[PDB]
Symmetry: C3
Subunit: 123 residues, 3 copies
């Protein structure tokens, strides 16, 4: 009269949930690439903005033999506040990523063990 | 002496976990919109940067009847590397999204079946 | 002959899954900060682009005592479409975030209760 069948359905449900959790992790990795990729493009834009500062007043004088170039900074480059803050952000993700892999590894061993034990009941 | 009550709590716990997993999926969809929305804004910025290249030296000559316009590229437009790489990124998300929906659909049918069977034990 | 041990493994498996779900939430929060941080940088870029519009034709005249400044808009600032749409995006995240916390709180109470009941069976 033991409800082994009900347990089989319950154990199977946990397996499906674990698979979906893993799918979210891969999807999360894809999202991270999009954000990081945008930053690389943003850095390229910063270099072009500096070039615009170089353009100020050229050939604006035909009674003198000189050209005035004023490349005043345009894109404010982040030296310490963004890098130090961004590194902390990346480091937090690395610790959470390692923790999720350890938890998933333990779940896989326990999941198989629970199903293995179930088979012994009705092998 | 069967622990049907314990099973009821266990089955209910799986239902709550499934709901939270679905909530993460919707939240993930909202995050994707933010990243994609930023790219559309970035493209608008690229068009303005090209306009800046057009500004070089105008009216810088009152002893000639001509104007010099030098629209040298400014924003580096991505023709194949980003589009091909971004399409692969979007395609990977589409396959994972379809897989999560299939897994969730199966879980919903199994979850209801497990609860339905539980009701038969004590209906 | 009750499978209390199998239930202990099953109950433990749910606990591990709940922990991983919580880890995804924190990771999701870190991802949100990266996207929002980029927008703040984008606004800074918009201010510099306006400055470029100011640079048009200076000193381009040595037979006149005047300077022509033409600061034509460059970065298209979003007044209502992005803010209204972005506020809706942020609001949707706030409702989903509150819903996930409520579901997790209920799961923690049910999880402890299921384990507490298990202890009574074999305390």
């Amino acid at each position: 009269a033991q409800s082994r069948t009900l347990l089989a359905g319950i154990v199977q449900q946990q397996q499906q949930l674990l698979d979906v959790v893993k799918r979210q992790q891969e999807l999360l990795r894809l999202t991270v690439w999009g954000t990081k990729n945008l930053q690389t493009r943003v850095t390229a834009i910063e270099k072009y903005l500096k070039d615009q500062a170089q353009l100020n007043a050229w050939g604006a004088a035909f009674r003198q033999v000189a050209h005035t170039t004023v490349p005043w900074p345009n894109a404010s480059l982040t030296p310490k506040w963004n890098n130090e803050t961004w590194q902390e952000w990346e480091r937090k993700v690395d610790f959470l990523e390692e923790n999720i892999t350890a938890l998933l590894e333990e779940a896989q061993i326990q999941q198989e063990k629970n199903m293995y034990e179930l088979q012994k009941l009705n092998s």
